[PDB]
Structure formats: structure tokens, C-alpha cells
Amino acid sequence: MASMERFLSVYDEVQAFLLDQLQSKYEIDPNRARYLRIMMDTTCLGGKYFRGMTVVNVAEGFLAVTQHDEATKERILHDACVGGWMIEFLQAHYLVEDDIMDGSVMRRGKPCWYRFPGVTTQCAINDGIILKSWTQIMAWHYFADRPFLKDLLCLFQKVDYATAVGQMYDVTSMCDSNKLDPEVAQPMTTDFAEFTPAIYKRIVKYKTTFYTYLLPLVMGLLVSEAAASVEMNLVERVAHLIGEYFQVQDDVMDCFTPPEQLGKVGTDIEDAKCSWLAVTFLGKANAAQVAEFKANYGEKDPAKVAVVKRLYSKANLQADFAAYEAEVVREVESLIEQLKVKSPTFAESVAVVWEKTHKRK
């Protein structure tokens, strides 16, 4: 079967396993099982599955050049699909909780989960907790007998933690660090001195690149029993580089992509986020432009938001993005060439991951 068709078929298996176990072992009633089935579908389905499919594609790459019985090929592909769904459910956890934390309105053209009438924040926070718990149930059940169980659970934990630390970096990025204090309401920065490329890169590395690129690539290696055959330092470097580019694209779209295509109204300017646009603007602005940015950034007022978008457009940030992109292309191609020394098959899988990232909306 097609890779995507296999991946979706495994979702139905995993869902049935989880819901059946709730019935047979957790005394759940049919109505609460239905609620959790709808929660799972609403929070986990409807994206592109590019993180989960990366696991599948990495595993497929090794299958083509490794001797295995057919039953083993089937096992490895099934494991890759389960591992991919672990990552999709982890993402679902962070989207549910982040939408609540940020007071977001829409996601993927539908209301955020907590805004469903029969959900509310009281249930949704716990639903997000359940989503991540399900990732561990998946691993312990499907990978019980597997040699990679330990390495996989350890990796998953370290990526989850990095991601939570990254979320802290992200939601506090508009405060001055020396003013951060649980006892004192956090004021927005006035000098924007911490809107720098290095600080931006730190925020992005932790908040998205570990779970969006490092985890799928390494999980693909683990379920293929192929990790020792690659230079892990290169995998890390290329995952963090591609992941940063992915987030830069997302930052630009938040500001300039029509809500109909974005699936939501972007509010990064109102929210005073340390976006690639803001950092890059401050890296080329003159004094008057900096002063105007400061007078308008981080406020809900639509007229102030429009002033910021006008500053961005007059600053020709398309040129900086093209320069950024060209440099990422250079560096990603270089890392792919290095991966070929030990792992020509894995290097090609990374080249496919990059092409998919580069060529996306």
C-alpha cells in the first residue's frame, strides 16, 4: 500500500486499541469513550502528517537496501507508523495546550478544541494531558518486545522536555529577562534589546525543531535499527537548521498569509512575539523606523498592527528572506553531502525532507 494509506490505517488500529483498553481496563462508559474518540480525531487528524510521515519515509529508505523477511519489513513499517503517530499525538498535545495558553480562536479553519461548546478549558487542559499520555501507552504496548524501546522512550522524553522549555522561551520573549519574576506582572520590553538573531534562534531551536525534525529523523533510525550507522552530530545539525527554516516560514505566514489560507487570524504582532520579521526588521531599520516600531508593536489596536505591517513591507523583508533561504540551502546541501560519508541512504531521506519543507506553501 501507499505510505500514507498505511499510516492512516495504523491510526484506526491505534485508536481502536486505546478506546478498547479504556473499556476493558478503565471502566469507561460508551459516552465518555465517544467523547475521547472525537477529541482524538479533532486534535490529531486533518494536518499534513509531515512529522509522522518522516518516520515512515526514513524507514522505507533503509528497507530498500537491507535484507529482511517480508514479515520483518511489515513489522518495521508498522513500527514506523506507530512511532509517527506518537509524534503526531505529541504535537496534538502541544497545540491543544498552546491554544489555551495563547487564547487562540481558530486552528485549521475550525475552533480551537477548548472552544468547542461541550469541551471548555476545564476539560481541554486534561484532554491535552491525555493526548501525551496516549503516546506512552502506544510505545509501551507496540514496542514492548523491541530492542529500541529504551532508546526511543529516552529520546522522546528529552525532546518533549526541550519543547516545553522552548515554549517558556517563546511566551516570555517579549519581557526583559531581568524583569522576569513570578511576583510581578510582566511588562513588555520597551527597548527590544533581546530581539536578536541569536535569541530568536534559541527560542526556535527549542520550541519546534526538536519535535518537528530531530524526533522524526531519529525515530526513523531507531525503528530501522540504523542509528549507529549515522553521525548523530550531523543529524542534530541538519534537524535544527531545517527546523529553523520551517519556523521562519511560519512567522512570515502569520503576518502575510490570508486567514482563509492560514486557517486562522495571525496575532504575532499583537502578542509582541519575537518573530523572524521583528528581529530582521530591527536588524535593518533606521532610527525613525525603530521608534515607530516601538510605538506600535504588541498592541491589539488594529491601526497599530497595520502600522507594523506597513513598516515590514516598506523594509523589503522579502529580500532578507531570500538571502536567508539561499544561505539555508547552502548549509543544508553541505550537511547532506556530509551525511553521505557514512549513510548515503539516510542522506537521500534527508534531502527529501528538505525538499518537502522548502517547497511547501
Ligand X SMILES: Cc1oc2ncn(CCCN(C)C)c(=N)c2c1C
User: Which amino acid is residue 77, in one-letter code?
Assistant: L
**From 9, 21, 133, 313, residue interacting with ligand X (rule: CB under 6 A):** 313
270 binds a second copy, rule: CB under 8 A: no
261 binds a second copy, rule: CB under 8 A: no
Contacts of 161 (CB under 8 A, 6+ apart): none
**From 182, 190, 233, 286, residue interacting with a second copy (rule: CB under 8 A):** 182
C-alpha–C-alpha distance, residues 297 and 270, integer Å: 7
133 binds a second copy, rule: CB under 8 A: yes
318 binds ligand X, rule: CB under 6 A: yes
- Contact 277/317 with Cβ under 8 angstroms? yes
Beta carbon of residue 160, minimum distance to a second copy (angstroms, whole number): 6
Q: Where are the beta strands (DSSP E) in the chain?
A: 106-107, 110-111
Indicate which of a second copy, ligand X, none lies near residue 317 (CB less than 5 to 8 Å, by partner kind): ligand X
C-alpha cell at 213: 525534525
97 binds a second copy, rule: CB under 8 A: yes
C-alpha cell at 300: 491589539
Indicate which of a second copy, ligand X, none lies near residue 8 (CB less than 5 to 8 Å, by partner kind): none
Beta carbon of residue 126, minimum distance to ligand X (angstroms, whole number): 29
C-alpha–C-alpha distance, residues 150 and 148, integer Å: 6
**Is 250 assigned a ligand-binding role in the annotation?**
yes
- DSSP conformational letter for 109: T
Interhelix angle 120-142/70-102, nearest 10 degrees: 160
C-alpha cell at 153: 522512550
Contacts of 258 (CB under 8 A, 6+ apart): none
- DSSP conformational letter for 187: P
Closest CB to a second copy among residues 92, 315:
92
Closest CB to a second copy among residues 116, 321:
116
Contacts of 133 (CB under 8 A, 6+ apart): none
Dihedral of CA 182/187/191/192: which sign?
positive
C-alpha–C-alpha distance, residues 297 and 252, integer Å: 16
**From 3, 186, 267, 289, residue interacting with a second copy (rule: CB under 8 A):** 186
**From 5, 12, 70, 183, residue interacting with a second copy (rule: CB under 8 A):** 183
Closest CB to ligand X among residues 9, 313:
313
**Residues binding a second copy (CB under 8 A):** 22, 26-29, 31-32, 34-36, 38-39, 42, 97, 100-103, 116-123, 125-127, 129-130, 133, 136-137, 140, 150, 153-154, 157, 160-162, 164-165, 167-169, 171-172, 177-186, 202, 206
**Residues binding ligand X (CB under 6 A):** 252, 256, 312-313, 317-318, 321
Annotated binding site for Mg(2+): 98, 102, 170, 250, 254
Annotated binding site: 98, 102, 170, 236, 250, 254, 268
